[PDB]
């Protein structure tokens, strides 16, 4: 499988196996986890090492992920303002979780959607957001550029 991907020093985009790797997470000072699926476990939850957030998306071509952007970004920013890293993952780290990361970069570093996509794709060549997620990213780009959330 692909390696866990540092996106920023406090933001890592990875897969379900990355989400089980306690050693790495503690090494990277990761205190927060976003699990972008409805059905995977919150790995290591009972250890009470991390602050977890489930974004219970299905990988269906109807899924709305825009719905979760605001809340995802608040949790990343909570991790950042307190000096910890955040791991965000789905099963493989290719579509659902990669879309949130791209959206966070468009919002919090004002990258265009193309530039944010190429930024993530350069660091994690695995990514391939589903077309309906690509559609939601373009609409979020319009919304960001007029002041509509």
Curated annotation (Swiss-Prot):
Cellular localization per UniProt: Cytoplasm; Nucleus
Domain of life: Eukaryota
Active site: 90
Domain Tyrosine-protein phosphatase: 3-146
Tissues of expression: Expressed in keratinocytes (at protein level). Detected in brain.
Function: Protein phosphatase involved in the inactivation of MAP kinases. Has a specificity for the MAPK11/MAPK12/MAPK13/MAPK14 subfamily. It preferably dephosphorylates p38.
Membership in a protein family: Belongs to the protein-tyrosine phosphatase family. Non-receptor class dual specificity subfamily.
Subunit-structure text: Monomer. Interacts with MAPK14.
Descriptive protein name: Dual specificity protein phosphatase 10
Organism: Homo sapiens
Positions spanned in the full protein: 320 to 467 of 482
């Amino acid at each position: 499988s692909a390696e866990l991907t540092p996106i920023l020093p406090f933001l890592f985009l990875g897969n379900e196996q990355d989400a089980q790797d306690l050693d790495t997470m503690q090494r990277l000072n990761i205190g927060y986890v976003i699990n972008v699926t409805t059905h995977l476990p919150l790995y290591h939850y009972e250890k009470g090492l991390f602050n977890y957030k489930r974004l219970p998306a299905t990988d269906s071509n109807k899924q709305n992920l825009r719905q979760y952007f605001e809340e995802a970004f608040e949790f990343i920013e909570e991790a950042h303002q307190c000096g910890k890293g955040l791991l965000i993952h789905c099963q493989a780290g290719v579509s659902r979780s990669a879309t949130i990361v791209i959206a966070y970069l468009m919002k919090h570093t004002r990258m265009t959607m193309t530039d944010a996509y190429k930024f993530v794709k350069g660091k994690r060549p695995i990514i391939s957001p589903a077309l309906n997620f690509m559609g939601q990213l373009l609409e979020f780009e319009e919304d960001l550029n007029n002041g509509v959330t």
